[PDB]
Amino acid sequence: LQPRRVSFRGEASETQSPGYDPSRPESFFQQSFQRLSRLGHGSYGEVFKVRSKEDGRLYAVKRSMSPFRGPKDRARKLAEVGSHEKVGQHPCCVRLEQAWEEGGILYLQTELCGPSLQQHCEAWGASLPEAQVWGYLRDTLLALAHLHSQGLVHLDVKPANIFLGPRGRCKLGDFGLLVELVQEGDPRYMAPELLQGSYGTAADVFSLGLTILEVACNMELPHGGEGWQQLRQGYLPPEFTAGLSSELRSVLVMMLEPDPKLRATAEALLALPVLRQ
Ligand SMILES: Nc1c(-c2ccc(F)c3[nH]ncc23)c2ncc(Cl)cc2[nH]c1=O
């Protein structure tokens, strides 16, 4: 059984590693990485914190759970590698180092950033200090501005797909649903125009608006029903918005504009005085 490199522009490496012995039963992932801990898991598979056995660097490796069920299953999983290729390098985006397949399992090796914003909020156990929130909002807007300037829509912006790096910075990741101007999204963060089949970069700004609202108010977002509709009418529900500053509420209202034709872009938001460097 051979591991096959899933090639993409920007992989930084063209070759197996000297430690890989193809005559051994263990997988390339087993032979080439020291497994340190499991960062997360789900129906998609597992994400491990690893050290490369070749150069000792820290990486994050995600592997799918079950072998490819067929060509379409494989194409859907491999598309996440193509999306990383379309994103390219940016300081606020998770960099894909390399990807390969073995035994029908897909492996994605990225830079190690840290826990997801969802995990960080679970540990903090309250509304995040608003100064931390502004930094995450700005860093993810920088990421969104990079994607949107290239005609890319993330379509899955949420705390689980933002990852914290050192010194309070974060990076947008998990590009499995990214499309170049489509799969089922998370309805909690879904822009209203997506229901009517209208897809644009504006949908990411709305999703980030609800993402910031969630972490800054420690409130759980509704999957549907009347509460879902409350958040798509241009106003903020009054209970949890009490603690937000005038400036933060002001930005969130701009991001949650229901009409995508009128909704501010990532570049417009980053040019506001409140979002200055
Ligand atoms: N890079 C990190 C990832 C990660 C791993 C593999 C991928 F293909 C990715 N795409 N986008 C992000 C990722 C990561 N995944 C899950 C959890 Cl719970 C924490 C994580 N922490 C990280 O720093």
Side-chain angles (χ1 to χ4, degrees):
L1 258 62
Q2 293 302 327
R4 175 179 178 276
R5 175 174 52 98
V6 183
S7 194
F8 62 97
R9 181 171 199 182
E11 52 187 350
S13 184
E14 287 91 355
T15 312
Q16 66 175 11
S17 44
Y20 180 54
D21 182 3
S23 300
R24 294 291 293 250
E26 288 77 21
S27 70
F28 179 83
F29 175 60
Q30 295 180 47
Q31 303 197 48
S32 303
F33 297 92
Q34 189 195 15
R35 275 157 70 164
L36 295 187
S37 71
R38 189 167 72 169
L39 297 180
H41 64 290
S43 57
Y44 66 92
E46 300 171 291
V47 181
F48 299 100
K49 186 175 96 165
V50 301
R51 285 193 80 177
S52 163
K53 288 191 183 185
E54 186 55 41
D55 59 14
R57 291 173 192 165
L58 293 167
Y59 300 95
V61 176
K62 179 168 65 188
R63 78 174 167 199
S64 55
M65 167 162 294
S66 315
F68 299 132
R69 294 170 293 211
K72 312 198 174 312
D73 184 29
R74 179 179 180 269
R76 251 186 296 261
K77 299 190 191 310
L78 293 188
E80 187 178 3
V81 176
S83 297
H84 268 286
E85 183 176 18
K86 296 180 183 180
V87 171
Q89 186 61 29
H90 190 272
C92 298
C93 298
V94 172
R95 173 182 63 260
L96 176 65
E97 295 288 336
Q98 68 180 359
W100 67 95
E101 62 183 317
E102 187 179 4
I105 305 295
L106 178 58
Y107 298 84
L108 267 65
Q109 174 188 354
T110 66
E111 61 172 315
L112 179 58
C113 302
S116 78
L117 178 59
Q118 181 184 33
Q119 289 168 328
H120 179 257
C121 288
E122 294 175 350
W124 188 244
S127 298
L128 280 182
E130 200 173 294
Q132 288 190 21
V133 173
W134 283 104
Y136 301 156
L137 170 62
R138 184 173 188 272
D139 284 355
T140 312
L141 281 170
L142 288 168
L144 291 185
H146 173 68
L147 267 58
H148 299 169
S149 68
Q150 294 186 287
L152 311 177
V153 192
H154 187 280
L155 288 179
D156 201 23
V157 176
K158 60 173 165 185
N161 298 338
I162 300 167
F163 303 89
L164 288 53
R167 294 195 184 83
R169 314 217 49 189
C170 69
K171 303 183 187 231
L172 181 63
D174 289 343
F175 302 116
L177 296 201
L178 181 141
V179 299
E180 182 176 8
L181 298 184
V182 174
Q183 305 175 47
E184 292 288 341
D186 196 328
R188 288 174 294 174
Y189 310 92
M190 171 167 63
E193 69 271 12
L194 293 189
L195 272 191
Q196 298 89 52
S198 173
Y199 299 89
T201 64
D204 287 338
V205 173
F206 191 95
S207 298
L208 185 55
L210 292 181
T211 293
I212 292 307
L213 184 69
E214 169 181 339
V215 309
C217 301
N218 198 22
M219 74 174 295
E220 196 168 72
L221 295 176
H223 290 89
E226 185 162 14
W228 187 93
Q229 202 63 54
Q230 310 282 39
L231 288 161
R232 273 86 187 165
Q233 304 300 129
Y235 54 77
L236 292 175
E239 289 209 351
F240 302 84
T241 59
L244 302 186
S245 71
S246 169
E247 300 86 3
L248 182 53
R249 276 205 222 86
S250 173
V251 173
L252 292 180
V253 170
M254 303 183 57
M255 307 180 64
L256 301 182
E257 160 64 42
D259 191 344
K261 290 183 172 200
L262 308 171
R263 185 178 311 148
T265 65
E267 289 194 1
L269 293 170
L270 288 165
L272 296 173
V274 294
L275 282 170
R276 285 191 283 108
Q277 76 192 8

